[PDB]
């Protein structure tokens, strides 16, 4: 591997051109050799010399690696000459080839990206090669969300974060603008996919540098969901939303995804529900004592017994699916979490009344007495969870109401909800208006527009 440098480094470009041509030809000839095994069309047929070598084995990997690593000698300073095939452009001419089938190989894409990043670290942006500063972003945006292995986003995101620090180190490059206006659009997609907890930080910090501001709406929609990931990405999302800009918060793209996910989850009736697991959820909603010491993520993957939802699973989606499953499990006659139906209903009514009266009064209880920071804010979370629980229960408690296509039939027990009438308890326990108007206003009209209308 030293002879390649010893041949391509010295002067007398008359011979360096031949050395390059030969190496690049061996490369662009081995690369298509894996085409037959992949059944792909031969491409990159522009630098190949007259050498029809037939490797047809793992030798292609090593040959391409040695022919690309040798090119680093030209992609390193100083090298005040560009009479060759412009390796700067060579690493991009093979994009459509070594990036569309690179998955089936997963050996050449990363090496090409590393060589390109090395060639760019010595010179990244100056405005002679001029479109380079724009070709970098134009190739990154295309190679940034062609979903690949974890060993690729970890370097693409790193190069992007390193280029962001140079953009704000330049200066009118922001108005390019087909690259930046898309380089940031792809950052928006890479902020969540994939769920690695390492690429998001490389994106939350890479996009935190840009002001920008072109499409901060997508950044705000991403932060509105990432602020609850329950991982170290929460702090990054918070610091990005507090530093990007105001008046656009306060301005839908991502929230609709969670809405559709919950709508699709509420239309399957997967009656696994881990009845024993619903107790540790009521103990977390009606009480602060957490029985599962993250624990929510270990629940969704446990539920639904495959063999649904996206790969996000963090965290409002799972936080709401837990309550929905607990409600589906309480829909059956007996609520194993508590005593018989008349006991669980009484417990819920008491927990709601002891908290609604707290509004026009002052009283201490496990819903507000939190003797630690970051937990008194969980009391509001408890109220929101209880409100959503009651709402989705009234949803699934319509076995007598005969829910429409929005919710499939509950089960063969669709008669117990018709024989027995729980609407009487809902009417006699409409104190949820007070216990809801405090945490979430809209959590009362759902019940307020019923008790206030049923009593015509």
CA 14 to chain centre: 51
349, with CB counted inside 10 A (0-12, 13-18, 19+), is middle
Q: Output the smallest distance, CB 14 to another protein, in A.
A: 26
145 binds another protein (CB under 8 A): no
Name which of 293, 289, 301, 297 is nearest 316 in CA terms: 297
Tokens matching residue 244: 């990007």
Instruction: Give the one residue of 133, 153, 383, 410 binding another protein; rule: CB under 8 A.
Output: 383
Nearer to another protein, 16 or 117 (CB): 117
Q: Output the smallest distance, CB 62 to another protein, in A.
A: 5
* Length of the chain, in residues: 456
Footprint (CB under 8 A) of another protein, residues 113-132: 114-115, 117-118, 121
Tokens matching residue 325: 């499953």
228, with CB counted inside 10 A (0-12, 13-18, 19+), is middle
Interacting stretch for another protein, rule CB under 8 A, among 12-20, 80-88, 101-109, 177-185?
101-109
| Site track for another protein across 211-230, x = CB under 8 A | ---------x---xx-xx--
Kindly write down the DSSP assignment for every residue of 234-247, as one continuous string: HHHHHHHHTTS-SS
Is residue 433 within a helix (H) or strand (E), and if so which, with residue range?
Answer: helix 432-437
Interacting stretch for another protein, rule CB under 8 A, among 84-92, 174-182, 381-389, 417-425?
381-389
Nearer to another protein, 135 or 166 (CB): 166
Number of residues that bind another protein (CB under 8 A): 126
Cβ contacts of 337 within 8 Å, gap of 6 or more: 275, 278, 279, 282, 326, 329, 330, 344
Interacting stretch for another protein, rule CB under 8 A, among 17-25, 89-97, 271-279, 423-431?
271-279
Footprint (CB under 8 A) of another protein, residues 13-32: none
Instruction: Give the one residue of 380, 411, 422, 434 binding another protein; rule: CB under 8 A.
Output: 380
Q: Output the smallest distance, CB 58 to another protein, in A.
A: 5
Instruction: Give the one residue of 97, 134, 156, 161 binding another protein; rule: CB under 8 A.
Output: 161
Footprint (CB under 8 A) of another protein, residues 38-97: 55, 57-59, 61-62, 65-66, 69, 72
How far apart CA 6 and CA 4 sit, in angstroms, is 5
- How far is CA 256 from each of CA 203, 252, 260, 263, 399, rounded to the nearest angstrom? 22, 6, 6, 10, 28
114, with CB counted inside 10 A (0-12, 13-18, 19+), is middle
Nearer to another protein, 46 or 271 (CB): 271
Footprint (CB under 8 A) of another protein, residues 192-211: 196, 198
- How far is CA 57 from each of CA 22, 26, 34, rounded to the nearest angstrom? 21, 15, 8
Nearer to another protein, 69 or 142 (CB): 69
DSSP-derived letter for residue 138 is H
Footprint (CB under 8 A) of another protein, residues 282-321: 282-283, 286-287, 289, 291-293, 295, 298-299, 301-302, 304-307, 316, 319-320
Contact 208, 243 (CB under 8 A): yes
Kindly write down the DSSP assignment for every residue of 373-403, as one continuous string: TTTHHHHHHHHHHHHHHHHHHHHHTTTTTT-
Is residue 24 within a helix (H) or strand (E), and if so which, with residue range?
Answer: helix 13-33
169 binds another protein (CB under 8 A): no
Footprint (CB under 8 A) of another protein, residues 344-363: 355, 358-359, 362-363
Footprint (CB under 8 A) of another protein, residues 225-254: 225, 227-228, 234, 238, 241-243, 245-247, 249-252
Tell me which residue has tokens 């792909």. 40
434 binds another protein (CB under 8 A): no
Instruction: Give the one residue of 381, 400, 434, 451 binding another protein; rule: CB under 8 A.
Output: 381
Q: Output the smallest distance, CB 366 to another protein, in A.
A: 7
């Amino acid at each position: 591997d030293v002879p390649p440098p010893s041949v391509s480094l010295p002067k007398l470009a008359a011979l360096l051109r031949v050395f390059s041509t030969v190496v690049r030809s061996i490369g662009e000839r081995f690369s298509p050799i894996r085409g037959p095994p992949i059944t792909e069309a031969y491409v990159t047929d522009v630098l190949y010399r007259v050498m029809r070598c037939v490797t047809a084995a793992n030798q292609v990997f090593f040959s391409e690696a040695v022919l690309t690593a040798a090119n680093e000698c030209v992609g390193v300073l100083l090298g005040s000459l560009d009479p060759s095939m412009t390796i700067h452009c060579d690493m991009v001419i093979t994009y459509g080839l070594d990036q569309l089938e690179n998955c089936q190989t997963c050996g050449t894409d990363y090496i090409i990206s590393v060589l390109n990043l090395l060639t760019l670290i010595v010179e990244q942006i100056n405005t002679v090669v001029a479109v380079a500063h724009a070709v970098y972003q134009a190739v990154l945006s295309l190679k940034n969300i062609p979903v690949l292995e974890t060993a690729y986003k970890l370097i693409l995101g790193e190069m992007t974060c390193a280029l962001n620090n140079l953009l704000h180190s330049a200066f009118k490059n922001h108005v390019f603008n087909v690259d930046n206006a898309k380089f940031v659009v792809i950052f928006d997609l890479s902020a969540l996919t994939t769920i690695g907890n390492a690429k998001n930080s490389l994106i939350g910090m890479w996009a935190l540098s840009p002001t920008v501001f072109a499409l901060l709406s997508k950044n705000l929609m991403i932060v509105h969901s990432d602020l609850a990931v329950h991982f170290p990405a929460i702090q990054y999302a918070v610091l990005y939303t507090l530093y990007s800009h105001c008046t656009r918060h306060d301005h839908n793209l991502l929230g609709i995804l969670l809405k559709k996910d919950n709508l699709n989850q509420d239309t399957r009736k997967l009656l696994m529900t881990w009845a024993l697991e619903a107790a540790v959820l009521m103990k977390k909603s009606e009480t602060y004592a957490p029985l599962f010491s993250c624990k929510g993520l270990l629940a969704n993957t446990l539920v639904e017994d495959v063999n649904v939802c996206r790969v996000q699973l963090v965290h409002s989606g799972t936080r709401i699916r837990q309550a929905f499953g607990k409600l589906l499990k309480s829909i059956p006659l007996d609520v194993v979490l508590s005593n018989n139906n008349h006991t669980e209903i009484q417990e819920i009514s008491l927990a709601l009344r002891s908290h609604m009266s707290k509004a026009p009064s002052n009283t201490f209880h496990p819903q507000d007495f939190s003797d630690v920071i970051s937990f008194i804010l969980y009391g509001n979370s408890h109220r929101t969870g209880k409100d959503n629980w009651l709402e989705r229960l009234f949803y699934s408690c319509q076995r007598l109401d005969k829910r429409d296509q929005s919710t499939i039939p509950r089960n063969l027990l669709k008669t117990d909800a018709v024989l027995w009438q729980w609407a009487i308890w809902e009417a006699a326990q409409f104190t949820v208006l007070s216990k809801l108007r405090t945490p979430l206003g809209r959590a009362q009209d759902t019940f307020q527009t019923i008790e206030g209308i049923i009593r015509s």
